[PDB]
Design a protein around this nucleic acid. Structure first.
Length: 356
RNA sequence: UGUCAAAUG
């Protein structure tokens, strides 16, 4: 069995759609673009546009299309880009063909991959971003191509309704986070990515209460708070304008209590002190959270924040961390008999008894 | 005691 038999029998489809036949095609396809067998196999692949797209959508044929993409030059890439463009939206939703698309974003010349990226603008961008296959195509574009090739995505997610529908989705929350990560990492003299990030993050902070409460978008809100210097201004905006004056309610929520936790873990001192003051100065708020099924984890993070903050340098901050830790220690010791009956109050006591 | 956390042979 040779490749010359495959060409003479006109049996590219039969080999490519078979598991062992495609592996034979992958291993023996000549890599050089001026090889005669290479050109004859490439012609058989792209002569019939419908045959090519069916091979892209085939469980085994897509691996051969990917191999052709790896060895492709600019002339071959021009033909492949034209074929993929005619059915690009459905190829991004297909289980096999989205892997052809994802490799094409990496492998094609940037102006060819930019053509495929920009073609998605007039399609259904929410349906792409939430598809089990399509969300990987969007993230591949964002992580690989220059921002000029996908700036329409930033404009699209600047609408609050688009952002909420995508960010609350199981897969779309990854799409929002990958866009945020790419725009927030660098530096740039004129800060074009900074301005683009500000447009995207404005929707995040406007709808942060709904997003922190959501089963999937709470991960995105946590990422902004936990990120560090890249998203530090947006972390502080989220804490000041959403979390403050709502800490008692959010610490009692199934998903938003995780947001309150990472805020206590990562806020600057000036915001930690406002958060501590809200809990302590309004059965008070600390008593509610100590016995709460979600709020007890917030108290445990409040304890760990004060334990680490005692070893700070400011020494006026370090006094306040000890003052807050002792105030938690006083309230736990008063209610220790009731707290010991459950694992939540036991873990709080075990954290306090490691020191005293 | 707390989270549905990403698609091919």
């Amino acid at each position: 069995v040779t490749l010359q038999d495959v060409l003479a029998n006109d049996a590219l489809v039969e080999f490519a759609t078979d598991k062992n036949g495609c592996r034979f095609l992958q291993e023996h396809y000549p890599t050089e673009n001026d090889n005669d067998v290479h050109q004859k196999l490439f012609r058989k692949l792209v002569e019939d546009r419908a045959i090519f797209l069916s091979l892209c959508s085939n469980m085994f044929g897509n691996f051969f299309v990917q191999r052709v993409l790896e060895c492709s030059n600019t002339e071959e890439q021009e033909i492949l880009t034209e074929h993929l463009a005619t059915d690009l939206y459905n190829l991004c939703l297909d289980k096999s063909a989205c892997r052809v698309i994802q490799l094409a974003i990496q492998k094609l010349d940037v102006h060819l991959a930019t053509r495929l990226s920009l073609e998605l603008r007039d399609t259904h961008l929410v349906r792409l971003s939430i598809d089990q296959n399509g969300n990987h195509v969007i993230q591949k574009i964002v992580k690989t191509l220059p921002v000029s090739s996908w700036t329409f995505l930033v404009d699209f997610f600047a609408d609050d309704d688009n952002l909420i529908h995508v960010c609350q989705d199981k897969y779309g929350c990854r799409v929002i986070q990958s866009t945020v990560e790419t725009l927030s990492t660098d530096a740039q003299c004129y800060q074009h990515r900074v301005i683009l990030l500000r447009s995207l993050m404005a929707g995040v902070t406007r709808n942060c209460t709904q997003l922190a409460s959501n089963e999937f978008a709470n991960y995105v809100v946590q990422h902004v708070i936990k990120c560090g210097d890249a998203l530090a201004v947006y972390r502080d905006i989220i804490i000041e304008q959403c979390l403050l004056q709502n800490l008692l309610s959010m610490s009692q929520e199934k998903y938003a209590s995780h947001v309150v936790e990472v805020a206590f873990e990562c806020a600057p001192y000036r915001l930690v002190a406002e958060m501590m003051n809200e809990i302590f100065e309004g059965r008070d708020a600390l008593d509610i959270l100590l016995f709460h099924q979600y709020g007890n984890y917030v108290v445990q993070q409040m304890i760990q924040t004060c334990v680490l903050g005692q070893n700070a340098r400011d020494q006026k901050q370090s006094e306040m961390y000890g003052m807050w830790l002792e105030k938690i220690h006083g309230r736990v010791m008063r209610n220790a008999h009731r707290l010991e009956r459950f694992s939540s109050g036991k873990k709080i006591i075990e954290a306090l008894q490691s020191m005293s």
